[model samples]
Target: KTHVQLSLPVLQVRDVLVRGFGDSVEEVLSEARQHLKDGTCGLVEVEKGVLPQLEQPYVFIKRSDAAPHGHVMVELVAELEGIQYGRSGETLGVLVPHVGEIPVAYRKVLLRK
Candidate 1:
């Protein structure tokens, strides 16, 4: 009898924070920079895709301010090889809020091994 062990790769996710101040792109970028520096913003994933047609990463941000006038945007980033794929070379899927799960086109980009 033989024993085998299987290991799964871990994916890294980051969140991008976009803040709307008086409806100005500069303000949004400024806020995003601050959030990035403070580790308060980034995408949900920062890994690579191992397969094709993979779903794009999703991000969620919990706001601390009251609504009505407050506005925020979130983005996602993932590497090209970190993604897991099925035998058909298609994207497995991505978990998204409200929209449920969906498939996305696989994009290969430079990533750190």
Candidate 2:
């Protein structure tokens, strides 16, 4: 078996706070929905279910076994379109918003350590 490791940053979704009116959570979610429709706020993706199609850059969240319990960690996977070349022609990882149409390269040959 071969494994490839990549590291990327994690994005956190902020909880919107509605002050002055003190509306319920449902109301806040409703307003958030409106904002998302209006492009004021972005959409939220579910991370608990099976992994979705890799269209955009996303971090894989996994349960951590190091802690006592209930700990988690995020693993990074760089998509094909999210890669950019530096001045020296070296590849640098980037977060792309659009889905990539090109295929990514993967080496299966075993390396002797």
TM for candidate 2 is 0.20
Residue range 57-104, candidate 2, lDDT tens digits: 332122222221221222222222444111121122212221222223
For candidate 1, lDDT tens digit of each residue in 80-113?
Answer: 2344221122222222221122222222211111
Relative to the true structure, candidate 1 reaches a TM of 0.23
Counted clashes in each candidate structure:
22, 0
- List TM-score per model, in order: 0.23, 0.20
Once fitted onto the true fold, the runs of candidate 2 whose alpha carbons sit more than 4 angstroms away are: 1-10, 13-22, 43-113
